[PDB]
Scaffold this active site. Structure first.
Site, PDB file in Angstrom:
ATOM      1  N   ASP A 245      51.879  40.562  26.954  1.00 42.10           N
ATOM      2  CA  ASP A 245      51.632  41.258  28.208  1.00 42.10           C
ATOM      3  C   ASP A 245      52.904  41.347  29.042  1.00 42.10           C
ATOM      4  O   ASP A 245      53.635  40.363  29.188  1.00 42.10           O
ATOM      5  CB  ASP A 245      50.537  40.550  29.008  1.00 42.10           C
ATOM      6  CG  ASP A 245      50.240  41.232  30.326  1.00 42.10           C
ATOM      7  OD1 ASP A 245      49.792  42.399  30.304  1.00 42.10           O
ATOM      8  OD2 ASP A 245      50.445  40.599  31.384  1.00 42.10           O
ATOM      9  N   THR A 246      53.156  42.533  29.591  1.00 45.38           N
ATOM     10  CA  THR A 246      54.251  42.731  30.529  1.00 45.38           C
ATOM     11  C   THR A 246      53.923  43.932  31.404  1.00 45.38           C
ATOM     12  O   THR A 246      53.033  44.728  31.089  1.00 45.38           O
ATOM     13  CB  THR A 246      55.592  42.928  29.812  1.00 45.38           C
ATOM     14  OG1 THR A 246      56.667  42.654  30.719  1.00 45.38           O
ATOM     15  CG2 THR A 246      55.722  44.354  29.310  1.00 45.38           C
ATOM     16  N   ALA A 247      54.652  44.050  32.516  1.00 44.92           N
ATOM     17  CA  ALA A 247      54.387  45.123  33.472  1.00 44.92           C
ATOM     18  C   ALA A 247      54.705  46.488  32.873  1.00 44.92           C
ATOM     19  O   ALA A 247      53.867  47.397  32.899  1.00 44.92           O
ATOM     20  CB  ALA A 247      55.188  44.894  34.754  1.00 44.92           C
ATOM     21  N   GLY A 295      47.283  50.520  31.150  1.00 49.53           N
ATOM     22  CA  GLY A 295      47.104  50.301  32.570  1.00 49.53           C
ATOM     23  C   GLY A 295      48.393  49.987  33.303  1.00 49.53           C
ATOM     24  O   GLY A 295      48.873  48.850  33.273  1.00 49.53           O
ATOM     25  N   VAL A 296      48.967  50.990  33.963  1.00 48.29           N
ATOM     26  CA  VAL A 296      50.170  50.829  34.773  1.00 48.29           C
ATOM     27  C   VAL A 296      49.903  51.504  36.110  1.00 48.29           C
ATOM     28  O   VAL A 296      49.854  52.737  36.184  1.00 48.29           O
ATOM     29  CB  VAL A 296      51.415  51.427  34.102  1.00 48.29           C
ATOM     30  CG1 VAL A 296      52.615  51.324  35.033  1.00 48.29           C
ATOM     31  CG2 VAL A 296      51.702  50.729  32.781  1.00 48.29           C
ATOM     32  N   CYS A 302      47.957  51.187  45.592  1.00 51.04           N
ATOM     33  CA  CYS A 302      48.182  49.789  45.263  1.00 51.04           C
ATOM     34  C   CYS A 302      49.675  49.458  45.318  1.00 51.04           C
ATOM     35  O   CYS A 302      50.522  50.315  45.578  1.00 51.04           O
ATOM     36  CB  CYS A 302      47.590  49.461  43.892  1.00 51.04           C
ATOM     37  SG  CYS A 302      45.783  49.523  43.821  1.00 51.04           S
TER      38      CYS A 302
HETATM   39  N1  LIG Z   1      50.772  45.279  39.911  1.00 54.45           N
HETATM   40  C1  LIG Z   1      50.174  44.172  39.465  1.00 54.45           C
HETATM   41  N2  LIG Z   1      49.271  44.262  38.487  1.00 54.45           N
HETATM   42  C2  LIG Z   1      48.756  43.069  38.146  1.00 54.45           C
HETATM   43  C3  LIG Z   1      49.060  41.802  38.689  1.00 54.45           C
HETATM   44  N3  LIG Z   1      48.314  40.819  38.065  1.00 54.45           N
HETATM   45  C4  LIG Z   1      47.577  41.493  37.161  1.00 54.45           C
HETATM   46  N4  LIG Z   1      47.809  42.847  37.171  1.00 54.45           N
HETATM   47  C5  LIG Z   1      47.182  43.878  36.321  1.00 54.45           C
HETATM   48  O1  LIG Z   1      45.951  44.262  36.898  1.00 54.45           O
HETATM   49  C6  LIG Z   1      44.871  44.027  35.958  1.00 54.45           C
HETATM   50  C7  LIG Z   1      43.616  43.645  36.700  1.00 54.45           C
HETATM   51  O2  LIG Z   1      43.088  44.742  37.429  1.00 54.45           O
HETATM   52  P1  LIG Z   1      41.636  44.668  38.078  1.00 54.45           P
HETATM   53  O3  LIG Z   1      40.700  44.549  36.893  1.00 54.45           O
HETATM   54  O4  LIG Z   1      41.645  43.414  38.929  1.00 54.45           O
HETATM   55  O5  LIG Z   1      41.479  45.984  38.806  1.00 54.45           O
HETATM   56  C8  LIG Z   1      45.432  42.977  35.016  1.00 54.45           C
HETATM   57  O6  LIG Z   1      44.756  42.941  33.772  1.00 54.45           O
HETATM   58  C9  LIG Z   1      46.897  43.375  34.904  1.00 54.45           C
HETATM   59  O7  LIG Z   1      47.053  44.462  34.005  1.00 54.45           O
HETATM   60  C10 LIG Z   1      50.039  41.739  39.744  1.00 54.45           C
HETATM   61  O8  LIG Z   1      50.436  40.737  40.339  1.00 54.45           O
HETATM   62  N5  LIG Z   1      50.539  42.990  40.061  1.00 54.45           N
END
Ligand SMILES: Nc1nc2c(ncn2[C@@H]2O[C@H](COP(=O)(O)O)[C@@H](O)[C@H]2O)c(=O)[nH]1
Ligand SMILES: Nc1nc2c(ncn2[C@@H]2O[C@H](COP(=O)(O)OP(=O)(O)OP(=O)(O)O)[C@@H](O)[C@H]2O)c(=O)[nH]1
Ligand SMILES: Nc1nc2c(ncn2[C@@H]2O[C@H](COP(=O)(O)OP(=O)(O)OP(=O)(O)O)[C@@H](O)[C@H]2O)c(=O)[nH]1
Ligand SMILES: Nc1nc2c(ncn2[C@@H]2O[C@H](COP(=O)(O)OP(=O)(O)OP(=O)(O)O)[C@@H](O)[C@H]2O)c(=O)[nH]1
Ligand SMILES: Nc1nc2c(ncn2[C@@H]2O[C@H](COP(=O)(O)O)[C@@H](O)[C@H]2O)c(=O)[nH]1
Ligand SMILES: Nc1nc2c(ncn2[C@@H]2O[C@H](COP(=O)(O)O)[C@@H](O)[C@H]2O)c(=O)[nH]1
Lengths: 460, 460, 460
Positions: A245-247, A295-296, A302
């Protein structure tokens, strides 16, 4: 994916922009639908818990895996804690749940707070591993907060041996004052509990199990440091699935991290993300990944979108990435932005094999966060992001990093006062996905993506 | 008592109706005043804690007895619970206080709640009876509610052996981060705790001790059942003072009780109440009581006065009862209605040897009630009356009794967020009484009653 | 009446100005006190319901008479309406109470509103006079407002024959679901109802009965028109006691009204009022009155005082009038200003034989007014004065009198959400009066008048 004629918008689509058109159906009931996934994850329902420390806890891993999902442990978790979490999950019963145990010398204060770590509503009082009483929240109301558990515990409760048909346990608890059946081993020791609702879900949900019949669990790893060494340590710890996993997944450092873990031939499915383009999906699969996490920056308001402007609407991202992964025999996980069961159904209709849910599951009893109350005494728990734990990396450098580092956002996730457990959300999610397959006419998830007809709607 | 010329009102006087007229004085400071009492109770300050379950607790009995007061345990308390309390109070140090003890396996939740049982602001971590660390509320703020005490504990602290100069243990805490000093036994075990303020009060307040040098403590008995067997059992537990308590002390069932307990010859001072008349005072003294407790419905809008109309303004009741008790060699205790230190001073100027304070001490850390917070997060503790435990004594019989029985009224007693300890109220009460003697010109309490000149004021 | 030494104020005293000093007592319990009256009214408790249309109703007459009191019907009530009310009270069981009766055809709307006319909390369903089921508040919750009683009635209930030992009925209702016992006649018809708490009041209160064992009831009559034939019709209608009532009792037209009723020789106790002076008390008894009702503008800020300046503090008025009536062989009634049980005890200690209560009992289920709810959903009933029906009397003449006519004031009387019944107030009043006798040392009301020692207090 097949859209209605003329529905070719000049923009990408979020989960709000699309709708599913009903088709001719032969599926009569929702229970005739098979929600089992076909991406090698082993999940019998298309629900994956995100690798976030606010969601992916040990109690969450046991509870979700018993109902068919899987929980990805958050990356950078110490390998000692990973092994203790895997050993706990792998040693759980596939039907009987782990209750909250209390000692007679424990305080009513701790007894009342520990109750909310499970959705059972009653805690088992134990002495040398054997049940001696039950404690409910009604027994703690108005009592001295430092009275002992022995002062409020009910002395009589329903007992049944492990292995009893959940149908019989369901009838035992019909006229019981407490809807909890304490399941005991043949020697009398405590083996767990089972409620009336827990017995019903045993006949509806198939647990996600490995080859040895133990509950499944996944683990995540960042692309910082030695990815191959951390990945092999997670595999030997007992992990059934690995998430790289990475951004920004469409990165050279990610492609090398996939080739490093894939070359070790650990015999586990490799999930890599995140990307939102077809090119990034093929580059990750060819690097050695079996599943691509999509998912990006799915939200237009946000942190990622407001800081950088980078992102893509999730539905159009999953549509393009799932089609690209299908041409290479891969699969796609829809990660991020899931708020309602229709988000899960639309993600599957777009072509995703699983749906990753994060912040939504934080507002449950089983999440690792502490249960908090606002000024209106409404139950809620805090959710927060991994922040730096998904990004790439003197004391001058330590604060040079924090100057530009991504701030950790915190949000309040309200619990439903009537259904605060994560299984209740699983009931809500799977109910909608099964009805979507009935509206489309699909008997399983592959037919949902095959027979669905999508349409675009305006703001009204 | 001497009043100003012409101040002969056609009504009785409460604490609000009278004032002290200053006289010629040579007493310099407050410390020259001897607040020691002459009623045989051994109290170095005229403060008695009432026999009420909402105030007369274990931690209360230890704290004020070190500062010169005495706590009357509530009547009808089981002899085993008494025996455990007296043996506790009699075994404490006359300077070093009892801390809040924590185990390294205790939870942050229990540790955070246990801190408010004392006024120290810090808890001592013990292992096999040896102090190893400290726990403050700042150490628990923002920490997981179910983390261990090993995860938060400050490992360094100020150590001094038991018996160290109370002036010296001050000096070490000059620039200490936490204003607590953990005293240790010669073999290293936990001896207790002493703070900076606790060092001054050790040099200002003289501990009320018996012939064995152990802290004084009293007990109450009811006139129901066999008073002789009960009262004799309380002194066998180690009681230094007994009081035969009832709502209406000027009754026949009462008189027969003292004549029974006085014939038992236990060699302890007997207190009896209540009466608000000279006739009731004399009849109780000749019955065998050494001290008479005064106070029947002191408030014009309390339960007794609004239900029955029976009562008397407390000041005019103490004046008449003190003059009649002195003629028979007996003394008078002023009971009820104390809200400010001037109520203590005016009760002493009226002729009482001690002042019984109750609900005012409920809003303290040392009271047995739980510390609660309202919607505005301000600390408070609830006080409640003894009800049937001060009156004359089959579900049908229990229903006849409860139909006319006095209801258990509850009231909110707020804690001072800066001075929430009972010793702070002791500093508040004694400072005003010592200043009252300086205005009058008295060096001790017997001189206060003889030199005081009083006056009457209107509502303005 | 004895006052403390010096308590000779230069003003008259209200119920707030005085207090009772406790004396030597041999009365052990409150149950040893005999609350019987000696004025010839036949009431076993010193409680009389005022002759106001907002409190003196049919249901109030039965409920108070069973517990030892008497209700004076308001004047100017049609003689036909009186006879139907008197015959109802005379035909009531001295223990078993009258429940709310429902026909199986009645609507849930009417059943829900009829429940609050008694204090039983349940209504009996009858077919041709025989009970078949119960209807409670929970039975009507969430039910269609225009369904029939046959859709919500509980078919099973506790049944005992009329005349059963009330303690056994108390024991049978130990674990019953509804605290309601339906009493049946020999032929099976509905004889009435009896609750748990009601079974205890049967053994505490003695019903006020006439020569024929029927519940007592009084009636009032104005001094306007034919006082003779009206008082003669009320006596022949079944009244046990007559009240010649007027605003200013010390006038010539009032004396002529007493002489007219006395010349009839109806053989009934005659109450006359109102006056606040000894001279007015002498003239009323010498006119032919047996009891004197005292009360002219008792409150300093009420309608009579602020309009005319005429009035007198009630305590000093009762003391003077009782002593004046005592030497003439008569008795006195304390009328007006009763707000707490203290007022009842002080009125009796002043020398009154009965205490007349009005607006206080209006906030009960048994009062004739409808139960209303404010914006906070809190129960209340409104009280109002008799106005013109207590003073001395073409359409032009009606408006000439209305220009100066006393307006009908309306006040809100809140019900106790846990004690909305008038019997609860009778339990609250008699519990305090019995305690006053124990503090004074009296075994009955005549002893209370002599043995009491009063004192004066200031505003504080
Ligand atoms: N931009 C951002 N995305 C995050 C962070 N922590 C997790 N995510 C992403 O957001 C997803 C969760 O989205 P949710 O289901 O809460 O809408 C995670 O699986 C990961 O891909 C964070 O600190 N910043
Ligand atoms: N007595 C008792 N303590 C418990 C129980 N469950 C948890 N705890 C305590 O609570 C703390 C951690 O609770 P959990 O959050 O459930 O444990 P965890 O291993 O962190 O699991 P997750 O938060 O689900 O990842 C530790 O101090 C445990 O001893 C229980 O059933 N009984
Ligand atoms: N771990 C720990 N428990 C404590 C401590 N002080 C009290 N307790 C526990 O708290 C509970 C009630 O404490 P208290 O209310 O102070 O005890 P008590 O004997 O009722 O005394 P009072 O209420 O002061 O009359 C008991 O179970 C005690 O064992 C402490 O310092 N550490
Ligand atoms: N079906 C039914 N109707 C009732 C019941 N009680 C009263 N009612 C009706 O409601 C009307 C008013 O009730 P009440 O106010 O108690 O009767 P009341 O004779 O005016 O008596 P008071 O108001 O007590 O002076 C009666 O005339 C009946 O028509 C009952 O138990 N069942
Ligand atoms: N009337 C009444 N007095 C009480 C009750 N409990 C305690 N008291 C009296 O009130 C005193 C305490 O008064 P305080 O100091 O709280 O004003 C006690 O010492 C006792 O004499 C109760 O329930 N009712
Ligand atoms: N001034 C005045 N007194 C009234 C009226 N109606 C009743 N009263 C008096 O007030 C008494 C009731 O007083 P309560 O018990 O409500 O304090 C009655 O018994 C009667 O003496 C009215 O309209 N005006």
């Amino acid at each position: 994916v097949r859209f209605l004629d003329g529905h070719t918008p000049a923009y990408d689509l979020t989960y709000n922009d699309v709708f599913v058109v009903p088709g001719r159906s032969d599926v009569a009931s929702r229970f005739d639908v098979d929600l089992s996934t076909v991406d090698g994850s082993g999940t019998t329902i298309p629900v994956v818990v995100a690798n976030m420390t606010a969601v992916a806890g040990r109690r969450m891993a046991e509870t979700v895996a018993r109902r068919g999902g899987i929980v990805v442990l958050p990356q950078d978790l110490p390998i000692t804690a990973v092994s203790e979490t895997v050993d706990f999950v792998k040693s759980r019963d596939l039907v009987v749940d782990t209750p909250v145990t209390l000692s007679p010398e424990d305080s009513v204060s701790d007894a009342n707070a520990l109750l909310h770590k499970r959705a059972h509503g009653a805690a088992v009082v134990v002495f040398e591993g054997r049940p001696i009483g039950l404690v409910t929240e009604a027994n703690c109301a108005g009592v001295d907060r430092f009275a002992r558990v022995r002062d409020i515990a009910l002395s009589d409760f329903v007992t049944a041996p492990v292995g009893t048909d959940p149908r019989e346990v369901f009838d035992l608890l019909e006229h019981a004052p407490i809807d909890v059946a304490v399941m005991t081993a043949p020697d009398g020791t405590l083996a767990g509990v089972l409620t009336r609702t827990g017995a019903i879900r045993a006949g509806i949900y198939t647990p996600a199990v490995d080859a040895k019949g133990r509950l499944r669990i996944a683990a995540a790893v960042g692309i910082n440091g030695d990815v191959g060494a951390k990945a092999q340590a997670l595999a030997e710890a007992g992990a059934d699935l690995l998430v790289i996993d990475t951004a920004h997944g469409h990165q050279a450092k990610m492609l090398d991290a996939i080739k490093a873990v894939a070359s070790l031939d650990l015999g586990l499915p490799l999930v890599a993300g995140n990307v939102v383009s077809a090119e990034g999906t093929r580059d990750l699969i060819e690097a050695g990944a079996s599943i691509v996490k999509v998912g990006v920056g799915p939200g237009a308001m946000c942190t990622t979108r407001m800081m950088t402007g980078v992102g893509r609407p999730q539905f159009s991202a999953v549509v393009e990435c799932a089609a690209a992964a299908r041409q290479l025999g891969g699969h796609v996980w829809a990660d991020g932005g899931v708020r309602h069961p229709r988000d899960v159904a639309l993600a599957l209709a777009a072509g995703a094999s699983n749906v990753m849910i994060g912040s939504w599951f934080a507002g449950t009893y089983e999440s690792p966060g502490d249960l908090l109350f606002d000024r209106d005494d409404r139950p809620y728990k805090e959710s927060y992001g991994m922040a730096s734990k998904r990004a790439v990396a003197s004391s001058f450098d330590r604060a040079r990093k924090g100057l530009f580092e991504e701030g950790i956002s915190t949000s309040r996730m309200s619990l439903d006062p009537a259904r605060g457990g994560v299984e209740d959300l699983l009931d809500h999610i799977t109910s909608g996905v099964r009805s979507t397959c009935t509206y489309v006419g699909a008997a399983n998830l592959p037919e949902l993506h095959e027979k669905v007809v999508l349409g675009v709607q305006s703001a009204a």
